[PDB]
Paper text:
RadA from S. pneumoniae was purified from E. coli mainly as a hexamer and shown to exhibit ATPase activity in the presence of DNA, with lower activity on dsDNA than on ssDNA. To gain a better understanding of the interaction between RadA and DNA, purified RadA was incubated in the presence of the poorly hydrolyzable ATP analog ATPγS with a gapped DNA substrate consisting of 30 base pairs (bps) of dsDNA followed by 60 nucleotides (nts) of ssDNA and 30 bp of dsDNA (Combination CD in Appendix Table S1). Density maps of hexameric RadA bound to DNA were obtained using cryoEM, yielding a resolution of 3.15 Å. Strikingly, the ATPase domains adopt a helical configuration in the dsDNA-bound RadA structure. In the CryoEM structure of DNA-bound RadA, the Lon domain has planar and hexameric ring-shaped C6 symmetry as in the DNA-free crystal structure of RadA. The flexible linker connecting the Lon and ATPase domains allows for this symmetry mismatch. Here, we reveal a cryoEM structure of the RadA hexamer bound to dsDNA with five ATPase active sites occupied by ATP-γ-S and the last unoccupied. Upon interaction with dsDNA, the ATPase domains adopt a helical organization. This places the KNRFG motif, which includes both the arginine finger and the catalytic piston, in close proximity to the bound ATP molecule of the neighboring subunit. The primary contact with DNA is established by K216, which binds to the phosphate of the DNA backbone and coordinates the 5’ to 3’ DNA strand (ZF to Lon domain polarity) in a manner similar to that of DnaB loops. A second region corresponding to the N-terminus of the helix 188–204, named RH1 (RadA helix 1), coordinates the complementary DNA strand. In the CryoEM structure, R301 is involved in a salt bridge with either E76 or E239 in the most retracted or stretched subunits, respectively.
In Gram-positive Firmicutes, it also has a role in natural transformation, while in Gram-negative bacteria, ComM is the canonical transformation-specific helicase. Comprehensive biochemical characterization of RadA from Escherichia coli, S. pneumoniae, B. subtilis and Thermus thermophilus and ComM from V. cholerae revealed that they are functional homologs during HR. Both RadA and ComM were found to be ring-shaped hexameric DNA motors powered by ATP hydrolysis to direct three-stranded DNA branch migration in vitro. Here, we present and compare the cryoEM (cryogenic electron microscopy) structures of RadA and ComM from S. pneumoniae and Legionella pneumophila, respectively, in interaction with DNA.
Author numbering:
A (entry chain C), B (entry chain D): 54 to 452
C (entry chain E): 56 to 452
D (entry chain F): 66 to 452
E (entry chain A): 56 to 137
Write the structure that this text describes.
DNA sequence: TTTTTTTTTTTTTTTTTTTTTT
DNA sequence: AAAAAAAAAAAAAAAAAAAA
């Protein structure tokens, strides 16, 4: 080795190969990078070995794959494969735990892709410690990193997780690999969310959602079924907003029902929405747009119980209230994003590009967004993007 | 050797070289200091080596740079460089991992600035045990502080972190080096913040905020939704406040809508503020300034959902309420800062100099502050700092 | 020799720095013949603090500053930032314990400051610079020098990655005083707190603010000053509250106005509105202020949360001054809990409170009379015992 | 058993098995600065009234100890100080005094220079301890040992000392506590677990005799609407005062503003008084507080709360030496309470003339003769007896 | 043990105390080869119960009573109250 | 024939990780 | 929010042991 000037452009471009799973490719950042290390953590049972077996089958159509498993015997893995089904043209399988015995086979198969079905179950013969020991994990991961960086092998490592929900072993492990994925999914849903917390080769904002099914993990193409309901005739008082949950844009319906107050102080009731925010929005509508609302009771709901924290919902909430009060329908493919100011201005929102992209992917026609958010934003040309400046403009255009 | 002197001693000055990233220069106390040690810690994948490759390029425009790394090969570094820039001042890469060859090549090329990358990923063949040993990093740190002082090389060091997020290694590491930086970001946010916990050459309070983007880190300059020209021109009931978001001042905007109640009682709906605080402020206004407000509803909001609960916002809240009740605008170039006492006094506030300086940087023309806070303040030339001591003074000056 | 109880003792000649917020932590001043240990996180400010101490003590006696971790140029550059060498002192930057022992015997300094015992070493043994044996022998040498020359020694000790002193636990036994210098990244105050001091109370902490011109002592941590009340401002009063161990001054403010619409609000901040409405009920029953038909609005100034029962008297006097439209004197302070019978009940730490009010230059403090039993009033403060709220209201207004 | 000498700190006796037995060792460990040397100087001075005492110190020269003694002020009849570290010289001074109560101010700062090790060496301290054992055995001297502690607290070589040591107890306290707790952990001659507690002061350590948190008796004159109740701070009984202000609802509607108590419990209590006693409280505001901010909320308070409310409504004073304990039922029955014996004994210790208690709870308890324990059945009976 | 296939069977030698209201809470008696754990509210009778049970089992067989938490003198002085 | 010494061992302290407990 | 289980390292008590 020698020091070199940066203009010694020995950099060959990374011809990263795509698997068939677009959800997997996107989290990785376009594809599997040769010579990368990917560490997949996640709770027991969540689907890590299923995911890796699927991608191993798909990659075996394009390159040689070696699947290495300490924790499971070859018959179990073949039983899962036949439950999933693939030609498995060049898919090698190797149940092993001794690092020298895997390294020897790696140096003859020359696998383009290597799966390590659990790092905590594979041991160096050098280190005396138990298979989950910190020193064992350190030595095995350093040897795998040598194999990867020397032979351009892409290595997928399954990591055991502590009861905290964070990867076990020395933090050196998270420092040394190139990509760290978590695989997780709460019991309220069937969906399994794959997310990158580190990715030296791509954006860590991309997340992939799978559903676990008999016969494998299948991609879910719409994360949010809860909007899907085609509207009744009439159906006044509904609007749709591209809100946000964690990092993924999710599109959700807001509904309102405005009715004349009787025999009490006018009272306002919500679900999934802060009633303070709704009271503000109703005050803005009554002031700036002249909707008589201090004599109306109002009821607001988000479909599917998705809780709408962020201020970007306020414009869609106002449009829902207006649609109910006017008793006139919005279009089922109009979508609304923006904070509503008490001076009636529509205020810019973060992540505007992702929201417009997601609205385009779900096939909406018109998305209304704050005019000042549009600066330098490139729209997808298939969806009409309307920049709006004040609530009176939105009401006059929608109604 | 055998010194021993009175305090009359050479007092040699410290020169500084600024990077082009003012957000980075700020944290170091105004620029890189020759012969200093700066230690960078932070979560895996946070952006440390992008930041250091950016600053490595900028220093490379004004001096020779040697970038060592044991983490990554020269090809990966060059691919990153192409991703984030034009290679407009080429510098040296060295993929070395053993300290003797580093010391050799650094003595031969004799750089102005040196970057180690991770101190935990370099070892010394003369001593001790495993990579990342406490025994190893201590001795490498001693070698670096020597090489630094013998040559006046400024050295930047990446440090691993524990799972708790504190710097790894023996505390001798955190004592021998001169500057210790943390690079961090909460998962609910897009920003990365860079903060000093120790800095022998400047204040630690100055943090720097970056956004991660496809072309690298970019300094945000404005951590807030307050973009001045957002204001709806004819807007009334809005005012801006300089608020401490922890250690950093941020702009925030307080909006009020004030309107007569059409019921036997009046609402006090408030988002982002304590409604008891707003109710106290309206009682101060009604008693001292004579605004008839018990007949009026008030609705109050903070822009962008920022939670504003420090006493310094009371003045801007009072001015927003008064602006709405009077239906007169305020100039969007004025900031307000001050606690409001039930006497109508504007009480002094903490960190007043930071607040004035940050109001100055984003180009505000006036800021109203407690007059008693003005003592010893270095107030910048570009902004007229208007001392005030009663709410009625503010209302006469502004309305 | 067992000299029984006949040995003769002379009072320690406690010298003082100008930083009273430092002197308080040592329990009144710097004793001679003594070891002080300063611990704290890296970067906290220990060297800045001991530089300022050196420069101040140099006005009283000879100071020698030694530092194995920092060159004399860096120390002089810091001193030039902090101020000027008008009180010039000796600076050695030595690492050899034998050399500093010889130099101390030559110069006979009144005060010695060692900025890292983790870098002094003696050649009689060798090893890692911070080795337990090296620090133990060096600190034994320092215990000799302290006794032999009556020298006050300030030692900077390193700290582990938890907030505890490194090196042998025997260290905290040999030394006479142990200080931790501590702070929090969300803040910018530094607290200096003792964990051991056999020459004086360890119930006192010093507070500092790190600034460009050094560690400024924060004599008054509250945003509460006698200079800043509006001349005729009614409806506020001062109370000596306690933040754990530290007496903290606080102002309570009250706005009383007729309840023109609806029914009586009791909107409150920093206080508790149940406490406040109790106090208004006591005033209305016992003192006769017609406060039922009044709205009342109360806040702590400065956003300090007030919990303890000692605030009741100050809150009552703030309400009463707001109702009566008669200002309280800004230099009078109130402490005491209010009973629903209108009695004023005893409070804890009464002496530490009166001492803090005296030290902050309050001309007068009101206290529950029965708490005066066995009390030791300072000279610079007038202390008034009161028995009932009627007595207070007659005396104040 | 063999006889016990008592120090004047009865708190110290009770943790030390009821008193220091002669001819045996005691080791007090604890964090530096906790107060070991102050405690042992007070103990040694109190024992000086019984016989000769020697205090040996390496870690503190005689002048500093004398300064501390003159701070505390206690008279020091035949109190010996000895600044020494040569253990053989200590042993010889033992025979030049023949003490009766010996103190070593730290085992880690005395050395027999011939034998072994450095002053910290486990062998050196163990062997010094083995010599001390012979000196204890020979002259029946009770020897108090100060222990250093490990960073963890484990007495800096615990096992080999502790088996020779007989009795070990730990002196400790937290960063903010004015109190320091002296916990006995092993003891051949008394309750193997106990906790002594002291407050540290500039006058020296002072016992916490009676509970830590009682603060009372600031009663004024004709203070209607006040009553006293015995309540538990877990296992400690404490004696606390309830105050009530009852006043007509001149404006608005009846408030129930309450602090310390639960306003639901208080609402039940005023409903019970309204129905069973016939107090017209529904048109009254009633304001209730526990004195001193004590979180006084356990079922046994309801009788005292009822008597405070009734005293305030009637505007007649409760006697300042009457105490009440009792749960109140919605039928006006007064129900049993958890630990009535301990409450009556605390009431007696604080010198209360009466305690009112639930009848059906006097069965099988030994009423102390100094206090008039009164059984009451019903709230109407209580209000007849008191008012 | 080494060889079994549902064979050797000493059965439960269930040994009573004189208090049947103790025996009834177990299987009608104590069981050899077993650990019984007793908890309870502190000082309420927890040790009094087991000391008395010892004074009743001592009639049937040898009982060794070990206390880390109380002195042998105070133990025997309490037992004398029985 | 004691004196290093040096392995072996204890054991303590620092530090990092992780299983319980609100 | 709190503890206890492994890893790494230094301090040290001890002895196999070869010297000086
Ligand atoms: N018919 C089915 N047959 C087998 N597995 C199924 C079936 N249906 C669902 N599964 C799911 O398959 C999951 C098993 O997880 P896998 O993908 O096989 O491996 P893994 O548990 O993620 O990896 P580890 O290291 O063994 S914890 C379980 O959570 C089951 O819910
Ligand atoms: N298009 C993008 N391409 C590459 N990286 C991206 C991209 N967008 C964001 N990144 C971020 O780049 C981060 C990697 O930053 P790095 O500086 O290379 O790693 P580091 O952990 O900070 O430092 P080391 O010592 O190299 S591990 C990832 O965590 C991503 O979040
Ligand atoms: N203009 C400024 N220039 C230099 N330092 C400043 C400045 N302003 C504030 N500082 C503070 O100075 C602090 C440094 O404190 P130090 O005096 O180095 O304490 P120390 O770390 O204990 O000293 P040692 O013994 O050398 S490690 C930094 O943490 C800064 O917060
Ligand atoms: N006016 C006061 N004067 C002197 N000491 C005080 C005073 N007030 C409190 N103290 C306390 O007295 C303590 C002094 O420590 P000691 O009473 O000597 O116990 P000790 O430190 O354990 O003794 P050893 O065995 O030498 S370590 C300190 O912790 C102080 O907090
Ligand atoms: Mg598996
Ligand atoms: Mg890197
Ligand atoms: Mg220093
Ligand atoms: Mg002592």
């Amino acid at each position: 080795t020698k020091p070199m000037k940066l203009a010694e452009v020995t950099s060959i471009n990374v011809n990263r190969t795509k698997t068939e799973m677009e959800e997997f490719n996107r989290v990785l950042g376009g594809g599997v990078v040769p010579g990368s290390l990917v560490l997949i953590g996640g709770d027991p049972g969540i689907g890590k070995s299923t995911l890796l077996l699927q991608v191993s089958t798909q990659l075996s159509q394009v390159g040689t794959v070696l699947y290495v498993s300490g924790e499971e015997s070859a018959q179990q893995i073949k039983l899962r494969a036949e439950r999933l089904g693939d030609i498995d043209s060049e898919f090698y399988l190797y149940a092993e735990t001794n690092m020298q015995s895997v390294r020897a086979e790696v140096e003859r198969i020359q696998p383009d892709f290597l799966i390590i079905d659990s790092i905590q179950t594979i041991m160096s013969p050098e280190i005396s410690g138990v298979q989950g020991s910190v020193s064992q994990v350190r030595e095995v991961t350093a040897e795998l990193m040598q194999l990867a960086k020397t032979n351009n092998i892409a290595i997928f490592i399954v990591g055991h997780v502590t009861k905290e929900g964070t990867l076990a072993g020395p933090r050196m492990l998270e420092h040394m690999v190139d990509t760290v994925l978590y695989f997780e999914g709460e019991r309220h849903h069937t969906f399994r969310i794959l997310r990158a917390v580190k990715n030296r080769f791509g954006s860590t904002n991309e997340i992939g959602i799978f559903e676990m099914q008999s016969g494998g993990l299948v991609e879910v193409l719409n994360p949010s079924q809860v909007f899907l309901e085609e509207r009744l005739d009439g159906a006044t008082g509904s609007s749709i907003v591209v809100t946000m949950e964690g990092t993924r844009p999710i599109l959700a319906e807001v509904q309102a029902l405005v009715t004349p107050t009787m025999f009490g102080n006018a009272k306002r009731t919500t679900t999934g929405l802060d009633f303070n925010r709704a009271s503000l929005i109703m005050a803005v509508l009554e002031k700036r747009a002249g909707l008589l609302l201090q004599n109306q009771d109002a009821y607001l709901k988000s479909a599917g119980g998705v809780k709408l924290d962020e201020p970007a919902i306020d414009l869609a909430v106002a449009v829902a209230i207006a649609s109910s009060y006017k008793d006139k329908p919005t279009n089922p493919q109009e979508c609304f994003v923006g904070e509503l100011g008490l001076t009636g201005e529509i205020r810019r929102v973060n992540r505007i590009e992702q929201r417009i992209n997601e609205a385009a992917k779900l096939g909406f026609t018109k998305i209304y967004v704050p005019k000042n958010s549009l600066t330098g934003i490139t729209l997808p040309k298939e969806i009409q993007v309307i920049g709006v400046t004040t609530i009176q403009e939105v009401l006059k255009k929608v109604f």
